[PDB]
Structures are given as C-alpha cells and as structure tokens.
Design a protein around this ligand. Sequence first.
Ligand SMILES: [Mn+2]
Ligand SMILES: [Mn+2]
Ligand SMILES: [Mn+2]
Ligand SMILES: [Mn+2]
Lengths: 436, 436
Amino acid sequence: AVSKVYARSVYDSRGNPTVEVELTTEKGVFRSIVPSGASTGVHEALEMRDGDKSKWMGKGVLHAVKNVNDVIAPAFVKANIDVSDQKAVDDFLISLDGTANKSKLGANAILGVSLAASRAAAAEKNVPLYKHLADLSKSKTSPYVLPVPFLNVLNGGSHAGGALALQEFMIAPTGAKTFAEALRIGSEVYHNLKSLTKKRYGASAGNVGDEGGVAPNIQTAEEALDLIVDAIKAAGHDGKVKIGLDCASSEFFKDGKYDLDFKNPNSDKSKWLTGPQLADLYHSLMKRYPIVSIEDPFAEDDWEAWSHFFKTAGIQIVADDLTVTNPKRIATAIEKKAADALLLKVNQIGTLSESIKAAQDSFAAGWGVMVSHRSGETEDTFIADLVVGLRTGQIKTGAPARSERLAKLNQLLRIEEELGDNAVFAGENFHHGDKL
Amino acid sequence: AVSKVYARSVYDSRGNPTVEVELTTEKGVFRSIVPSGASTGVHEALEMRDGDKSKWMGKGVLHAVKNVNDVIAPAFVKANIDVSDQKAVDDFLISLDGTANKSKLGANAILGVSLAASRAAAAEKNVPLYKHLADLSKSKTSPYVLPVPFLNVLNGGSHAGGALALQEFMIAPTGAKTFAEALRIGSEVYHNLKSLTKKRYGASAGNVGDEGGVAPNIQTAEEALDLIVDAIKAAGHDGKVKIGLDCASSEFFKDGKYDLDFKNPNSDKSKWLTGPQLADLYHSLMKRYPIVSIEDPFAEDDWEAWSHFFKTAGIQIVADDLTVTNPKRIATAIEKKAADALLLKVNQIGTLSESIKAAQDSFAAGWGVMVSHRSGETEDTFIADLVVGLRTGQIKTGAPARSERLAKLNQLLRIEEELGDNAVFAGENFHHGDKL
Ligand SMILES: [Mn+2]
Ligand SMILES: [Mn+2]
Ligand SMILES: [Mn+2]
Ligand SMILES: [Mn+2]
C-alpha cells in the first residue's frame, strides 16, 4: 500500500541535477534516479528543467521535484493503486499529466515514480526485480538471457576534436561463453586500447569522454577502427570481439547531404555525400572490419536512405534518433523496413509500461532491442534488471569505466551468478536474444 | 548472527577488478566493495592481486576472493562474533592474517568483511550507518557535522601531459551555509571551469582524469590557479570558494631536490629546488591565491622540510604519503610537528577499527582528518557515512563528475536532509569540524 511518494534533487554522472523519487510501502522505501543527458530526437517525452540561469546553469529540476511532492503524491496516495499492476500505475501517471510528451508534469517526475513502483511491486511479490519485469512483459524465463554488452571504447562526434564524424565505436565480446568472460575480455581490450592510445596520441588522449571511452584527435574512421583492431589484436582476443558504430548521422546531415568532415567550418562542399554514396562508404568499412551493428547510419527523417541501405546491409541496423522509442515512429520504421533493432531509452517515452510496450512491438516485427543508457547516468542499475527481464540479448551501458557505467555491468555479474544454470549468455544470438 | 560471509569479483571505476563481500545475518545481506587505486606509500596494508598476466592484465583478485570464501568465512561463521563489537571483528581478522601489513590474506579480503560487518551492526541496532560509526568512535552527535567537500577540478601530475608538476587542484565551497549549497556552488564552478577549459585548450582538454577533473596541457602552477579563479569568478562565487592543492611531491623529489619540471626527460638540473626554496614557492602562491589546504608539500621521508614549512605555513597541511594512515607514522609526524591534518584512506590500514583508531589519535593532537577516496572507487558510499560519523568536517571524494564520485556526494545530500535541524555544515571550521 503506498503510504508516501517523495522526491529530492540529486546529481548525475555529469554534475547536473536529476530527480530521485523514493516510494514507501509496508515493506520499505524503494528508490529510482532518472537518467538524463542528450543528443536527442524531437518526438520524445520531455524533461522538465528550471531554466533559472543563476542556479545550476539553468538545469535544476526543482519544479519536477515539486510536481512529484505536490501534485503526484497526494494524488497517488489517495488512488490506492496496486503497484503490481504497472499499467494501472502508468495509466494513472499519464492521466494526471494529460499531454502526449509529458510536458505537464515532466517526464523526469513521471519516470522516477513509474520505476520506483516496479521495485516495490517486486519487493512485494518477493522476486528479484528482473523476475517481475519478466512477469510484466511476458518473456520466456526458461532460461534467462544475459546480454552481450556493447562497450563504448572510443568516441568521435561533437564529442572529440579531430575530423572524425562517427560518434561511437563499440566492442562486443560476442565470442565469450559467459557474461563474466565477456566483461573481462571487454576490459582487457579497453585497457590495451588506452595504452596504444597514450603512446600514439600523447597522455592527453588517455582522458575519457562521458561514457568512459577515449577521444583522441583521430582523423579518419579507418584510422579509428584500426586502433581498435590493434587493441583487440594485442589483448589476445582476435576473432572473439566484434565492433559496433553509432554514427549519429543527424549530426552531419546538411542540405540533403552528409558532411563527413564537419568541425571545420570551412566546410568543403562537393565531398558531401548522398544517402547512396554514404551507403557505399559503410559497405567498404563493413568488408574490412568485424562490424556487426551500425546505429543511425542516416538522419532522423531520411527514410529512403534507411530503406535502401537495409535491403543489402546484412548486419544489425539500429534506430535511435529515427524512432526516439516512440511506438508511432517505430511502426513507420517497421512498414518502411528501415532497420531491424531499436535503441530503447525508457526516459524517452517516460513510463515503464510504455517502454516494455515498445520492445514488444519491436519483437513481434522480428526486431532486436538494444536496451540503453543516456549520457548522464546515475548509480542506479535499473537497466540491468531490464535487459534481463525483456530478454533482449544486448545492452549499451558505456565503456568499462566510470561507475555510473560499471554500476550496471556489476549488477549483470551478480544476476548471472545468481541464476546459476538458469541463464544462457546471448553470445552471437545477441540480435534475437528474445527468441532463444 | 552471521550465517554466511561470501565474496565475488566486481569492477572499479577503472575497469579493474576489486573485491565485493556480502555478509548475511537474521536481518538480510549487507555488502561492501573495496576501493582500490594507487599513488601509494610504502608502509601500508597490502592488496592481494593475482599477478597472472593473461587475465585482467594481472590485476584479478580471485585469490583475495578465495581467502574470503575459503579461509575467512567458515572461520568467521564458527566464531559467533557480535558484529556490534567492531573491535572484536577486526581483532578476529587481524588474528587470522597475522602479518603487520595484511599480506597473508590481503587487505582487500579483510577490509570488505570489516565494513560489511559495520553495516550489519547498524541494521541490527536499527540506526542509520553514520549513527553507528558515531557510536564506534565516540563523536559528539549534538549536532552532526556535514563536511566541506574538497572537489577535484583539475589534475596535473603523472596525470596530465604538460609541464605542471602539482597533482591535484581542488575547490572547497567553505562559504556555503548548507551541504546542498556547497555541492551546487561546487558544480557551477566546475561546469564553468570546463567551458573556459574547452575555449582555451581545445575540446580535447574537456576530457576528464580518473577523479573527474580535467587535465589540460597546462605549463605553470600559476597558470592553473588562474584558470580556477577565473572559473570561480565567472560562476559568480568569488570569495565563497577556496582552493586546496595536493602536490604529491614524492613524485618529483630526486637527489634531495625537487624537479618542478619532470616530464622532460632532459631534466634541467640547477632549477631543482631544496625544501626551503620550494617552501618559498608555496608561500608565493599562498599570498596570491585563496589556498587553504596544501597536501604533501614535501616528500614522504623528507621530515625536516615538513617541520620547517609548517612552523610558518598558517594553513592546513595534509599528510597522505608521509603517514600512509599508519598510526606509527602518524605519531612521528605528530612529535615532529610536521603537519596538522591526516588524509584517512581506510584501505591503507585495512580495517574499520584501525581507521577510526587513527583519526582519534590525529584528533587528540589537535589535527583535522580529511576522509578520502582512492583512484579506483566503486558505487559504494561507505565513506559518506564515515565522514559523518567521525565528524571530521571535510572529505575529498573526487570532482562533481563520474558517479563513483557522485555516489558519495548524493549520499551526503540524503543524510543532510535526513538529519534536519540536527546537522550543521562545517563551513569555515572544516579544519576542526570535530571540535564544533
Ligand atoms: Mn544523451
Ligand atoms: Mn545514437
Ligand atoms: Mn590512488
Ligand atoms: Mn596525495
């Protein structure tokens, strides 16, 4: 029986405020901290920030904390909602807000109460959290699937200062036989990556971006993929570790063309490339490197380049800014056959039922779901139980560095050991880990 | 009644393995993750690592996890120790090890069980953790003291690539009236610091070191302190925020001289300085900047430079590598009047009673105690309850970035709000927050 929903302001991996909600019931206090940070797409639940420039640079969430305390709680206490019924909870929160992108109370005020309730529901059913989330989404639980972690090792977009235009370079130990082995293989690769990084670029290049990867002054994509294969080669794991790229292409789409060299801004124009010319640079890279996932190859509204590259891509194609975890953008994405995996960011839709709901429609269309983090994360490991309950087989939770990252890798370590014989590692079936 | 002490290997802020111990009692499972990373001094409890170069670069702690599971637990279960009696616990762990620097079972195997037991003791007494730790050390609890956080904002030692030889540049909002205000003031300063950092040095300079600060290619100390006062000036908080330096001078002591320019290594020698010449460069800096704490001004065994600078320093002088949280090095440090504050790192002595014990002898000599983090931290917030139970008034827990950092700032937010009127903020009495 919820007796108190309360909220406070706390900080995120970037020293920026975020909302922390603790919900009380006859079994204790359950908490949740809302992730934050953006690259962000236009059709997503909206986050409420103070805007006062003389306090936290205008990013406090004091308001968002007021909506929780002042609006949601007294209302939520009086409803007498069964937290076990997550839809009841979320429908209640949506009802109270009444906008389509949650701009009334704020997607941060809403999410925090929506996730705290799922923890409380599990406390109460007496099953570990990943087990409830498995109940809520109706996933096989025979056995559970531990995911391949796509680890960010190197960054290059608006996030690094050389000419490199692709944003994230990720490694995936799909070759491993257990989660624990994938994580170990993954950090030996990373650690080597840093050493080579500091010899070649200088000690300055060893510093890390927000997600834990390094951001050396690299000039070409090839130049970056080569540093990662040397890093995989030196760690002694050639053939067991794969790559994944997040090109964040919306970033360099201009005039119907893609500028592989922005950051100028003496923008050479004639080297700019059409969907199809870029489609030829990705096939190049695909043949020379062990690339198995490409996230956002084309821009958020460039549907025909998506549909035309996917007809022959033969690899996993992820949509992040093209679908903004919006079930209405997912569905077009699906009728146009524009990709085959969705990046799910629960705070992009703002509620747990709506999240679980998107993965489900992505699954029924033959798609995969890479559960993912945000730029500004917290010590909350909610997404570890979530890639385990949805049984997706793959998770992007940063590099094996900065603990807002490792707080989730560590939780997958504990779940794996906990499940004993009841867990299989996705491995190479990362794509459809749900169908295993 | 402890019924099971068990351990597993988990990862640390740096992607390097560390020991996680969970202890069971009639009230649940209590856990602790051991911090790690070094700069490290010679007379301290020793950490046990595998040494196998084909696994985690030779840094696993599989062994350390075996000593816990295989040696400590079956022994610890059979003893039937009252966890409320922390000395009984720790004396038991010391007894089982029998070396002076814990090299028998490993200071990581020992610490993790020693801290998990204090959580369990508090569960059982039914008081929040900081309240127990206050019981164990006998500190006034009328009211409690929230600490001034020394935040790392800029790094320059073996940790950055320019000529700068001092290691840590820290800001301290002592001017604030609450903890929450100090943390906010602290992140607005930091965030400005990053902006100026990226204009002046390039986007590459915005990447962060291990503790969350930035490491720009800076050349002089002055050059660095000026960037921090411009950062304090722009954030709108001149006069409320102070500085602190960690010179890690052991790093550049060579032939009885200090090389302010190592990193050469065409080491100009003649510019090298004696204790007293360096004592004159710190007084310089002290008059031009709002410096209020200097950590390790001279090297770990250079006692006469310490004693001679402290007779006229007039600011807080912290010993980290000179005392290695060793009560026997503290005491000499005290008879020689070499400093006045101790950096306490619980894993440097390896047990909670021995830690609490060192702060106590530092306190009785008129000293202050800056409770501190390690280079490789985890999502464990144990040190937040500890600066609150010892009532020291000051804590070094990294910059307001990377959540292994913010996991502890966030916990001080929650304790502060929890204590209501029962907490005062150290502010400007950070030095002797214990005597307030
Ligand atoms: Mn983001
Ligand atoms: Mn993306
Ligand atoms: Mn260290
Ligand atoms: Mn130091």
